[PDB]
Amino acid sequence: DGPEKNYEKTLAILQIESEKAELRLKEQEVRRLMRARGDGPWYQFPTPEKEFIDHSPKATPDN
Amino acid sequence: MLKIILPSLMLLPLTWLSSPKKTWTNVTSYSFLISLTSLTLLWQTDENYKNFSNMFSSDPLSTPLIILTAWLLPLMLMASQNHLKKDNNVLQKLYISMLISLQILLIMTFSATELIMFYILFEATLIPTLIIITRWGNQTERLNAGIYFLFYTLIGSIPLLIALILIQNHVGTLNLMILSFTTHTLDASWSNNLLWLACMMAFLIKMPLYGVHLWLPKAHVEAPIAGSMILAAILLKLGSYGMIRISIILDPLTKYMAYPFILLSLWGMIMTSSICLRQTDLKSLIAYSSVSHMALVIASIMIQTPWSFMGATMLMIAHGLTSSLLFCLANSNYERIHSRTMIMARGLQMVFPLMATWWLMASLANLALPPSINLMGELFITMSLFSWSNFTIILMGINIIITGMYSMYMIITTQRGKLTNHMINLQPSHTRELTLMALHMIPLILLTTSPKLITGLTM
Amino acid sequence: MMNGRPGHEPLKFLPDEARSLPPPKLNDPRLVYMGLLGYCTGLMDNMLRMRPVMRAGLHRQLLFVTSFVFAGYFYLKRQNYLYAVKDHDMFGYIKLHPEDFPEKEKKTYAEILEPFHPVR
Amino acid sequence: LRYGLLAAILGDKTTKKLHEYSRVITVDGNICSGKNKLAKEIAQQLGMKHYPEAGIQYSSTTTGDGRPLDIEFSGSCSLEKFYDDPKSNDGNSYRLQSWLYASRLLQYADALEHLLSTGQGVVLERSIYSDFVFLEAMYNQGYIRKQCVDHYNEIKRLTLPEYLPPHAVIYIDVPVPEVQSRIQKKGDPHEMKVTSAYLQDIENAYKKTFLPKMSEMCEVLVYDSWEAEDPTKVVEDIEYLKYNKGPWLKQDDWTFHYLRMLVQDKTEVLNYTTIPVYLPEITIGAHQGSRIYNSFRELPGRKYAPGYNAEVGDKWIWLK
Amino acid sequence: QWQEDPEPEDENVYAKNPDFHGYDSDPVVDVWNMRAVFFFGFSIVLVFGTTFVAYVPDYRMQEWARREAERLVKYREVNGLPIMESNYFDPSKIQLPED
Amino acid sequence: MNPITLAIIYFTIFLGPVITMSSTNLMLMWVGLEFSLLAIIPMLINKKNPRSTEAATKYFVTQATASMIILLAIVLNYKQLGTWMFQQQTNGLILNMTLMALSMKLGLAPFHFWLPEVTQGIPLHMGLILLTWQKIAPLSILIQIYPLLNSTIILMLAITSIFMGAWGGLNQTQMRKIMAYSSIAHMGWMLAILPYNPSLTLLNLMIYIILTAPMFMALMLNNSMTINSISLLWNKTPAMLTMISLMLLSLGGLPPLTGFLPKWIIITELMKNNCLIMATLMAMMALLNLFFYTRLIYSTSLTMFPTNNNSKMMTHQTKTKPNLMFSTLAIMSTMTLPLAPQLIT
Amino acid sequence: QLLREHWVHILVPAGFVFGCYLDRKDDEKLTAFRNKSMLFQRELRPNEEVTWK
Amino acid sequence: KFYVREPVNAKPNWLAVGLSVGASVFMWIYLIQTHNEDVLEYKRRNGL
Amino acid sequence: PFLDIQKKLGISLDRHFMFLSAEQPYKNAARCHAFEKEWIECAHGIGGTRAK
Amino acid sequence: ARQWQPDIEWAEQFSGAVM
Ligand SMILES: CCCCCCCCCCCCCCCCCC(=O)OC[C@H](COP(=O)([O-])OCC[N+](C)(C)C)OC(=O)CCCCCCCCCCCCCCCCC
């Protein structure tokens, strides 16, 4: 086919690999920041549920 | 690259679906055609490397190794055809499957553009060689040879895996071209020295140093002829290829970190040539000669000169061809006499004239003869080493003298002299094994005629 | 690590957001390899039971290949959903916290002085 | 394997299909004393199933085409060669004895499978409980050695207590000169070269060990020749026998079920006969073993599983 | 000792097939394997492959580099330019660090 | 036996880990562990030999002591916080006692001494049920408390389990003891990756289970107990040899078998968390594991050990091998490396 | 199926054709910078769809 | 009969054969239908 | 791991007695009902490190 | 020559439960 086909294919391959490397580094930094301070969707450790707290009036008023 | 890999993958269903009287013929013919197909990536007009895929790539360094592997598969089939004639058909097809899988995995290893995929295919090639050596070896020590080979390779390769994952976590990609372009200098710390050692010692085990080399003579003695062929012609060069690939990201500290291995290589090539002089086993002699030539390759890659890299590539291809030829000749004598003792068959030039001619040409290739790529590679390695330091010429000269001595000692003690007339069972010759010698030697002549192909990356 | 994300319905194989993603093309190397594994499973089963390796059990081999392709397709769609939602969460976090991920400006090879290490 | 836990749950109870003549009757005696005809007549007029004495070719006759295989496929015993020359340089006497023990074990497993599956009683000739008499005669005559005896005893300990003893043990006592005269009148040239000391050794092993050790777990019907050579008084004794001892009384449907599974899986039956104890009279070696195995697989009807052999039939090869 | 086959003697292969070619015991498969090895190994891969490699043009830009070097040398000679300037990159587009 | 008690015992064996992994109360996790132990004991002591009795006794006292320590940790947590789950602010002493007791339940070193003893003297299918199914419920509890674990104690237990498992499997010649030491090494890997990624220890657990299910199935086919017994497999079942060798290599972690994937991805995550020393030591002892696997391969596949006379009768008879279970798991445990991004989650 | 018998001789040629097809599919897969490199970047010609296929 | 004892499978287990063939056909049909529904839903959700 | 068949099926086998301030038998309290209620209502929705 | 295969010695070195 000629040298231009291999040239442009190499450029496309390099762009794909560079974007993948950038995204991998971004993923590492995002995971580290989330686990350091959990504020995104990931590393959300559980907590006792609100929906099983009895809010009805008790036998004792001081509750 | 897929147009080469996929026919070799379809070789296996051909092997298992062929009739038992047509299996060898079909597989040999189609593997020859696959080598002819694998000749198509020598079409390198531009300086740009042929990147076929996002995971497969070509190279002036990778291309001769791929072509040599694809050429060597039918040669292994021809060599291993005779010593499997009294065997079960399932075992024969399994042996052919082992050889074909070796060819597939080695082509993928040389064409791989990612270091982690290179590592995966590296150990994938580690498997069927172990199976071949242990399952079809002749003597008792094949199990010890397999253990030595396997665990030398694995203890080498585990720090390589740690280093590769470290590099991937640092730079993000572990792709060869991205690393080659945005390579980063190292700040010369002890961690970087250990990183250099971890990424070098796997390949320094795989092609033999003077230290760890003890697995190579055991594996070569105990292996069958196809196993000796594939080992001595591809796998040491696989270690060298890995060193050339991975040396690019270790720019500032190789120039002092390569000191012990250069000394180890030079003194070890002297000592192993000396062992070849006082060696009583023909396969051991060829194995230690392989250690010496690969020591030359180690020294050239360590000194990292363009002349050194070009000479390393030329010595890689030339040594693969001539070591396979020597192993095939020794195997022909061993199939005659069922013993590898060198002093026992002596006057074979009398009864085997053209086999003696192949012996003479193989030994003239073994020593450096100036119309040969062997001398081309050795001479340019010598030039680069003398540029590195002028005092290396003493070790080079001693090595060349002992190399000529053991090669001519081989010829004189196994071909010339009075014929051991008690050996009745000296069948005249097989057209198969004469063809095997010719298919080893004619590519040496053609590559001597045009050595621009065997020149590697640097020029 | 992604089990605690908001909107995570438990023990759900494919939520409706997965319906927003393009499915596998049904002839892609993952599913072709899964079918090949099913075929090899049938052949190995025949050889272990000491039957003809391919001449026997054609219905068994067909069932093996079909089941492997079926399960592989649905698992592959689930994994595509998981990778897509991981990328979505990462990009959303990047957009939410820009001060922790600065667009670092790289300069050309005309201001930086790379040290030169000669190989004499 | 059609029978299993599911079949037993759906109802295949051995105690449901049992019968007053669902007995295991083992006929025993010396080398030539009327036990082949006696077992035939007892099975004939009790409605049992007659199992003749398990020879070298028992597995060959009960598996495959049913024709006897080669002398290398079916062991390497050669009872004629044992009679011609014991104490050979190769171990032929113990190879023959161990192969006969394994063959008798397979026959006993087949008989138990038949009895537990159909309820019909079985009359065996010289079951596994009366093979150590031959082994001890071989050892005391010096034909084998203590290593062979220990290996046999180990295999017997591994295999024997997993089964059930016969309901009745009939014995035909006959003097050694009478056995010698019957052997000479039979006219077999190999069998004529037997030692009277060897026959007396077999009889002594019988009387000293087999009769009491089986009398403590089942009933014994020692007869003379004149009490025998008349297979009707024996049948009347069997009819009016009382089965009031032994492990056949303390077991139920599920013990029968697990025994039936263990006895219908023939590889589990013969598993402990192939222990890797490397006795040179028994072990073979890789090259001869692989040659014999490949030739046996190249025999007709033996290359694949018995449902799958196109050279002998089996038309529906592609749908099973 | 164990029951082992002895070591077999190796037969003279030319005693029954004097035209033996090294490949297979029966003559027909042997001669066809010889013909297949010679045709596919010498005729179509050692000749056609050699011709293909020989007629690969401008292998790694060697002839192109010859022509381009001749053109550049001729240009710089007839225009009086210093042939092969010492610095590759232009000094005006390189910024050096201060002091 | 008896079908009714078979159903009861096997249902309770199933029900134990299910309750443990599906219950959010630590008390219900503990009663699931108790269910698993008490249900699996009669399956252990079933042949009524002295070795079975000893194995059942050792297993009972070990798991009872470990479960008592677990219940101590649960009660102390309930005293400290009033809840029935370790939420975030429990005592590190309570958490370390939980980890130690669950390690003794799992059987990793230096609490590993009973595991080859119990696995020996027990039939092969019960060894399979133990070494696969009994290790999910304690691992489920460990995954539930994924943070708030002591990484120091985790890494010490992991490294000593991998070291001791490699050495023990190197020494042993009994197949069940070999499988137990393999279990100890792989549990060491899972515990190593536990505080950094629950997905990776789940992946390694699944790979180990699908790798050692057909190994035990192939042992169960010929009732092969020793290295010699598995060595005369070329005469018994010669079609088994390639799959046996490939699964042993996959248990060794050789590429390109899929058993390389768990070690590779665990090493990757530990590189991401900067534990290169632990990762390197673990990889070298995994090479030792591969050595004793390769000696097993030499015995069973690549050479032909001598056989005896009665194997001719064994070749005369016919056999039966489970469909849909052996071949499927063997193929998925050997040739599934290129599906690695799908396998990791 | 007129020839039959030795049907296995189409296996490796089929693999070769499929490999060439897969290489063509990978070339169609990359497709980026069709004329966007600084080196070539030529005009699209009066009768031409793409520079390389 | 060639064999002295009847083999366990001398005739096909037709229930198993029909069940396996029908399961394969049903799984292929369901797979093609759900792939068509998936591509239709994906195109409908984001345009074409 | 932690299966969630109780949340998937909507049942509550053991979820109504996880803590002190949860469904006492007749109408009673657990001596820290208000404090545990305030802590759980604080920690819900932000659980883990932020709740700590 | 003939390929060596393990003899009684090589086969008996793997018994003893300790190795
Ligand atoms: C077969 C050859 C064996 C001998 C030679 C093997 C290599 C020898 C030199 C390297 C050290 C040992 C291998 C480490 C592999 C990882 C290297 C690496 O990533 O280095 C960078 C890392 C450092 O990581 P780093 O570079 O990211 O460090 C952070 C640096 N800053 C902060 C500046 C960014 O090195 C290590 O972590 C080394 C720890 C090694 C701990 C384990 C040692 C085990 C025993 C040593 C020998 C093991 C092989 C022989 C076994 C016995 C055989 C008989």
Ligand SMILES: CCCCCCCCCCCCCCCCCC(=O)OC[C@H](COP(=O)(O)OCCN)OC(=O)CCCCCCCCCCCCCCCCC
């Ligand atoms: C690449 C990796 C290889 C790895 C191993 C591969 C093995 C399998 C090989 C398969 C086939 C591939 C062949 C590769 C070599 C091809 C040789 C060839 O034809 O080269 C081209 C050359 C003319 O090309 P040209 O451009 O002029 O050469 C460079 C000039 N600047 O052509 C010629 O000059 C003509 C050559 C053929 C004519 C006959 C030559 C006879 C030479 C006699 C030499 C006698 C002395 C030998 C001494 C030996 C001592 C040991």
Ligand SMILES: Nc1nc2c(ncn2[C@H]2C[C@H](O)[C@@H](COP(=O)(O)OP(=O)(O)OP(=O)(O)O)O2)c(=O)[nH]1
């Ligand atoms: N060495 C040896 N020979 C045995 C064994 N079992 C049987 N034989 C021999 C003894 C006889 O020569 C031959 C036939 O056995 P029988 O006792 O059945 O003799 P035969 O059928 O001639 O007489 P019968 O009417 O049955 O009493 O087999 C055994 O375990 N070991």
Ligand SMILES: [Mg+2]
């Ligand atoms: Mg008789």
